[PDB]
C-alpha cells in the first residue's frame, strides 16, 4: 500500500476541544443533551469515592476507579440511541465531546447497557475506541468484574435490583477525573475545579433554563469519600 492515512482519532477530538475553550460550557452542553432527550431533570454530582482495583476488566483500568463527575437525567436510551457524523457519540451533538476536558474514559449507562469510550484506543485493544456491556446478556461478566461495575450502583436510584433486573430507567454518565496528562488533554480536575464549575453554573441561574422547555430542575451535589452527601446548589423553573 502506497497512500495516506488520517491523523488518529484523538487529534480530531483535541481539535473539537479547541471549539469549547471555557469550562462552564461543559455543564451547559450536558443540559442541552438532556433537553434533546426529553428529560425533565438533571443532576450533577461530584463523587470522591475511591473504588477497588482488584476485579477490573484489566490492570490498565486502575486509573479510572477514583473520583468522578457524575451526571444523571431521567430520559432513557432506545435501541436507536445505542446504535447511533463520525466524531459524534451516539446521537449526541458534537458538543458532548467537551467532556474530554475532564476525562479520558467517559462512561454512559442507560436502559440495559453500559459503554465506556476510549478514543486513545489503548484499553480494549488497538482498533477499539471503547467497550460495551449488556446488563442482561453479559450479567455473568459484570458480576465477575465487580470492582469495574460498583461505580454504577448506589447513586441516582441504581441498586442491586437495577443489575438483577438488567434495566436502569434513566441515563447516568460517569467521568473519572484525569490523573495524568493524556493526548486529548492535560487538564487535571480536582474538587475545587469541579466546585468552580458548579458555582459558575449557579451564577448563570437566570440564563441556564431560560430557553429550555423540558428540563425544569438542575441540582448539584457532592459525595465525600466517607459517603457524606450534600446538595450544593439547585436551580429550578
What does this structure look like?
By secondary structure, the chain is an alpha+beta fold. The protein has one domain (1-237). Helices cover 25% and strands 22% of the residues. It is built from 8 helices and 8 strands. The protein has helices spanning 9-18, 25-36, 79-82, 139-144, 146-149, 160-165, 191-203, 205-208, and strands spanning 41-47, 68-73, 107-111, 113-117, 130-134, 168-176, 217-223, 229-236. An 8-stranded mixed beta sheet has the order 5-4-3-6-2-1-7-8. A hairpin with a 1-residue loop joins strand 3 (107-111) and strand 4 (113-117). The chain starts with 8 loop residues before the first helix and ends with a strand. It is classed as chaperone. Keywords: alpha-beta sandwich, Bergerat fold, chaperone. The assembly is monomeric. Crystal structure of the F270M, K291M, L318M mutant of SR1 domain of human sacsin. The protein is Sacsin.
Write the layout of secondary structure elements.
Layout: H1 9-18, H2 25-36, E1 41-47, E2 68-73, H3 79-82, E3 107-111, E4 113-117, E5 130-134, H4 139-144, H5 146-149, H6 160-165, E6 168-176, H7 191-203, H8 205-208, E7 217-223, E8 229-236
Parallel strand pairs: 1-7
Antiparallel strand pairs: 1-2, 2-6, 3-4, 3-6, 4-5, 7-8
